[PDB]
Design a protein around this ligand. Structure first.
Ligand SMILES: [Zn+2]
Ligand SMILES: [Zn+2]
Ligand SMILES: [Zn+2]
Ligand SMILES: [Zn+2]
Ligand SMILES: [Zn+2]
Ligand SMILES: [Zn+2]
Lengths: 364, 89, 131, 89
């Protein structure tokens, strides 16, 4: 099953999510050695690396200070187990992390300079590269909160006054925030999803689904979910209540707010995201087709880079070599590689004349 | 007011001269085939012809930069060795 | 360094480097507060930034009520230190520092060493108080 | 008003990732003993097992960081060599 490597991925996930499994640092080294030993006898490393990078993105784009030291051990074990390939991709991603933190501190410094709008009272912007980080979505363009509007405007003006050529793109499917609510002043938490709805409530309460779907222009796909993160299926810490109590989502349902003094502190967060690992059909199949395209990339690149300094095949000579080079990566997939090697003909770059399969063009 | 935002932590992505209106190698568009494809079909025969993403955040049609890697290497819009950090838009 | 050697005075040179850090952070925060300065509560502020182990613990960071315009000044300073100098936790205390209380026949400015600010502020809010 | 504050001179102390809820070397708490100690007694026999304070404002149980001074030296959370600017909370 390929669901077993997806499950090693989810193991890594929940393991690093706990961030306390095995208080003894010695038991940590042993369990990591046993984990990499178990991974040694595993095939289909492409999906493993994909899900490990997704877990890296999930653990680095959230609350920091998880371990702060085990990342070096992880990358060293990856170097010593996988090699210098996807681990070099991980090193590039860590260089990206460095870039982001440096740019963040620099922008805080440049905000202590103008401070004209109070929109950026407390800010924490991260600058990453469209590459290393996986395609998040279609950069949602839903109405954004105003103090955040002023903060984003200041940040964009700064980034265009200095780093010209690096165009910025706005999105919502990443990050968090601290909503200072107000008998005490308990600060809430919103993961860039409930900011717009709560801001529309601040502007005018007594809204419904029509109000948040008409004067907001937000992708319906990722909208119903944050809607229920704020109501449907909440424990006795509800920050957004409604009169029509029901499981399914209606249209004409008024939203209200409750006190819920059960929060014994001033920093109460609603961590409805990152729930029990479900791995639904849509996202799973999407990522599976993505990794099939990634295996296509692998085979094609391998061929164009190696067969430029090797001999030619007649029927099935070089395919054995291209499968042996990818034996430790994933399955050979004979039908897929046979269908893909015969597409290069109408694009040169190792065209492989099918009828005149006696001498291949050793040119560029 | 009843709810006031104190902190924010957006993450801002950035793009180099990917030119979403014109691949810098062949000059057609970020998508919409290339000079070595023209017609959508033109005997597609599986394979591909989407977009290639470098580490220097530059973008071209996969084939254009693959054919450019036979002429040079350092990505044309800078002096950094071109990498393949992505495939597709 | 020439009598007892590194160790103690080496940590003392580290403490003078910490003093440099404090005097640079104070000037930097005044620069940040120049926007709408000499107004509301942030009229004249002199905040110092020190490190835990470096300075002796005279207490456990007391948490009594803080004063009038001083509330707005401390709020502005904390917002700035959390927006620009994000990375550390600014714990509040009272057993250190001073202040200049402008009283008002002339306007004689008093002085309070972070101890009489709360009591005098409660008197300003309403006089005729007791223990 | 009768009394108005003009100047102020607070001194603001700061702390690094001391993590008051989980010493980052035993994953327990800034206090409450270390991994090996745990039991308040466990033959205490004088000695100690409180908290160690570095120059980089990081905090761990004295034991954990003393046993980590054999694995490495420079405090992992930063890159500066770990010093012992304090003993106890
Ligand atoms: Zn092109
Ligand atoms: Zn093409
Ligand atoms: Zn480039
Ligand atoms: Zn410990
Ligand atoms: Zn101990
Ligand atoms: Zn440290």
């Amino acid at each position: 099953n390929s669901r077993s490597p997806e499950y090693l991925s989810l193991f890594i996930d929940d393991k690093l999510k706990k961030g306390v499994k095995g208080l003894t640092e010695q038991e940590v080294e042993t369990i990591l050695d046993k984990a990499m030993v178990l991974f040694r006898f595993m095939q289909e490393k492409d999906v493993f690396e994909r899900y490990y990078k997704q877990h890296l993105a999930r653990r680095l784009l959230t609350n920091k200070s998880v371990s702060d030291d085990s990342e070096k051990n992880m990358i060293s074990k990856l170097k010593t187990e996988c090699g210098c390939q996807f681990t070099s991709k991980l090193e590039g991603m860590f260089r990206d992390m460095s870039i982001s933190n440096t740019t963040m501190d620099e922008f805080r410094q440049h905000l202590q300079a103008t401070g004209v709008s109070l929109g950026g009272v407390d800010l924490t912007v991260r600058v990453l590269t469209t590459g290393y980080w996986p395609t998040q979505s279609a950069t949602p363009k839903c109405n954004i909160p105003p103090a955040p509007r002023h903060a984003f405007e200041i940040f964009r003006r700064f980034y265009l006054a200095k780093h010209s050529g690096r165009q910025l793109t706005l999105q919502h499917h990443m990050g968090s925030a601290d909503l200072n609510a107000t008998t005490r002043k308990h600060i809430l938490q919103v993961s860039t999803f409930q900011m717009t709805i709560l801001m529309l409530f601040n502007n005018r309460e007594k809204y419904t689904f029509e109000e948040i779907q008409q004067e907001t222009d937000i992708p319906e796909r990722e909208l119903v979910r944050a809607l229920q993160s704020l109501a449907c299926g909440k424990p006795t810490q509800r920050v957004l209540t409604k009169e029509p109590k029901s499981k399914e989502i209606e249209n004409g349902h008024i939203f209200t707010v409750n006190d819920q003094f059960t929060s014994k502190l001033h920093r109460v967060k609603i961590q409805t995201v990152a729930a029990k690992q479900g791995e639904s059909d849509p996202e799973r199949k999407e990522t599976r087709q993505k990794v099939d395209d990634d295996r296509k990339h692998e085979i094609e690149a391998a061929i164009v880079r190696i067969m430029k300094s090797r001999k030619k095949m007649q029927h099935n000579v070089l395919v054995a070599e291209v499968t042996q080079q990818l034996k430790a990566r994933f399955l050979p997939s004979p039908v897929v590689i046979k269908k893909r090697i015969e597409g290069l003909i109408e694009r040169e770059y190792l065209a492989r004349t099918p009828e005149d399969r006696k001498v291949y063009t050793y040119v560029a | 007011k009843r709810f006031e935002v104190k902190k924010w932590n957006a993450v801002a992505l950035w793009a180099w001269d990917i030119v979403v209106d014109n691949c810098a190698i062949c000059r057609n568009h970020i998508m919409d085939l290339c000079i070595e494809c023209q017609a959508n079909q033109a005997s597609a025969t599986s394979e591909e012809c989407t977009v290639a993403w470098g580490v220097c955040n530059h973008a071209f049609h996969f084939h254009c930069i693959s054919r450019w890697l036979k002429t040079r290497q350092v990505c044309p819009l800078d002096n950094r060795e071109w990498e393949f950090q992505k495939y597709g838009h």
